[PDB]
Structure 1
Amino acid sequence: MLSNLKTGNNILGLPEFELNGCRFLYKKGIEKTIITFSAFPPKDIAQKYNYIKDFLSSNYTFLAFLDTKYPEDDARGTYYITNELDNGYLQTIHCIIQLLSNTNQEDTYLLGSSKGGVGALLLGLTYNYPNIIINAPQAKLADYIKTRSKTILSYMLGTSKRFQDINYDYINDFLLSKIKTCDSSLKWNIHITCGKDDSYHLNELEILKNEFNIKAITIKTKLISGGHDNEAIAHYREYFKTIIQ
């Protein structure tokens, strides 16, 4: 039962649950379901639940998810991809939302920035969540992990030297593949912001945009002030609060 899934941790008065290695916060509300995804924290900093304070007074239904618990020596997550490089973790997140949420899919909103934005896209494109409002997601996943933690990257690549380049390309294109295989008939409502001084993720956004374009998916984009920093996040928070209401 859900009460038995409690980890015994409380974040800002919200109990933490864990199911199949997937840690999450859950608050039952009304009208809408808000889903947030964690980004890469700094090294030796624990993974953080995102945007709790924006919706604690809102009385919306709120679910916040963390990334996986691996690798053990740098436990900042594996981009919501399993040790087997498949959808097993996304599948668990989907089951949690579908059973705990008390609103329709059209009234559910996936939120996240950077790696958290990618997790939102991965879940949304795999399982048909139409409302995705995210900031500065990556396009080439392996290239970015390389710039954040060699420990996590080498972990996902695996031990066998003969498959390192193959696994690199597979991880690098994991999100682009989800775009290539998604349902183009869905009424997608995808919003992507990006700090105007975040040149790296401005280029990543164009890579993502080209994939959506050829799938006949028109997304909304907005340039905000800042780089890949707390200033962009501040304006991204103002953005998703606006369109949600």
Structure 2
Amino acid sequence: MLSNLKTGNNILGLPEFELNGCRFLYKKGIEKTIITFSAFPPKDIAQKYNYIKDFLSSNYTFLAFLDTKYPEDDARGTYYITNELDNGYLQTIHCIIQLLSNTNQEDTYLLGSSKGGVGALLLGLTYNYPNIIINAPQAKLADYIKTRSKTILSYMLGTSKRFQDINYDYINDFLLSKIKTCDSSLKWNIHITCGKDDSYHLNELEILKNEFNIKAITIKTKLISGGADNEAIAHYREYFKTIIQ
């Protein structure tokens, strides 16, 4: 029963729930389902639901997801990939959306802005959610995680030295392969913004674009003012607010 999954936290009035290690906010509305995924918090800051305020006044159904809860000594998330390095976490997010949302998948929109954009794509490309509107996702996931936390990377690489560099490359290409194995025949509505001064994520975007091209998937991109900063974030929020409206 949904209310027995409550964790006791409340965020801007919204009660937090947890199911199979997957923490989420849920509010039942009408007409559209908005889904947001959490981005990478600063070191020692708890994971945040992002882009609640953008929909507080809305009448839409709203869900907001956090990342996994491990490694415990740097619990900032493993990029929506399980510690078994498979889809188990995405699978749970999918069940939650499919059973609580009151709209079909074409009236559902996935949002997220860094790690959160990667989460949005991983879910959308696995389970065919067509509308994905994200900012500056990472493409080489393990390369990036290495710059932010050895604790998380080493947790995900595993204890066996023989498989660490294998797991490294598997994590690194985890998103790219989701593109390589997605449906191609779906009418995707993927929008990816990125700050014009975000040199690092513009090169990540080129990498993602190539993989879509190989798969014959058209996406929309838009450079916005700013870099890897809140100027870009501010413009991302205005961008997705117009697309949904």
TM-score range, shorter chain: over 0.9
Residue 162 of structure 1 deviates from its aligned partner by 1.1
The one-character-per-residue Cα deviations of 1:168-201 (angstroms, maximum 9, x if unpaired) are 1000000000000000000000000000000000
Identity of aligned residues (%): 100
d(CA) in 1 for partners of 2:28, 2:157? 39
Residue 152 of structure 1 deviates from its aligned partner by 0.4
d(CA) in 1 for partners of 2:234, 2:28? 25
d(CA) in 2 for partners of 1:226, 1:144? 20
Report the secondary structure of 1:232's partner residue.
helix
Residue 163 of structure 1 deviates from its aligned partner by 1.0
Match of residue 180 from structure 1? 180
d(CA) in 2 for partners of 1:118, 1:174? 10
Residue 159 of structure 1 deviates from its aligned partner by 1.0
The one-character-per-residue Cα deviations of 1:93-147 (angstroms, maximum 9, x if unpaired) are 0000000000110000000011000000000000000000000001100000001
Report the secondary structure of 2:159's partner residue.
coil
- What's the TM-score, normalizing by structure 2? 0.99
Residue 228 of structure 1 deviates from its aligned partner by 1.1
Match of residue 90 from structure 1? 90
Residue 16 of structure 1 deviates from its aligned partner by 0.2
Residue 40 of structure 1 deviates from its aligned partner by 0.5
Which runs of no fewer than 5 residues in structure 1 stay unpaired?
none
Map 1:55-94 to 2 at 5 A.
55-94=55-94
User: Please, which moves more after superposition, 82-91 or 160-169?
Assistant: 160-169
Residue 59 of structure 1 deviates from its aligned partner by 1.3
d(CA) in 2 for partners of 1:113, 1:149? 19
d(CA) in 2 for partners of 1:66, 1:205? 23
User: Please, which moves more after superposition, 63-72 or 227-236?
Assistant: 227-236
Report the secondary structure of 1:98's partner residue.
helix
d(CA) in 2 for partners of 1:60, 1:66? 20
d(CA) in 2 for partners of 1:225, 1:149? 28
Report the secondary structure of 1:203's partner residue.
helix
- What's the TM-score, normalizing by structure 1? 0.99
d(CA) in 2 for partners of 1:147, 1:212? 26
Match of residue 137 from structure 2? 137
The one-character-per-residue Cα deviations of 1:72-94 (angstroms, maximum 9, x if unpaired) are 00000000000100000000000
Residue 231 of structure 1 deviates from its aligned partner by 1.1
d(CA) in 2 for partners of 1:6, 1:166? 38
d(CA) in 2 for partners of 1:227, 1:12? 29
Residue 55 of structure 1 deviates from its aligned partner by 0.3
1:148 matches 2:148? yes
Residue 164 of structure 1 deviates from its aligned partner by 1.0
The one-character-per-residue Cα deviations of 1:29-78 (angstroms, maximum 9, x if unpaired) are 01000000001000000000010000010111000000000000000000
CA-atom RMSD, angstroms? 0.4
Match of residue 211 from structure 1? 211
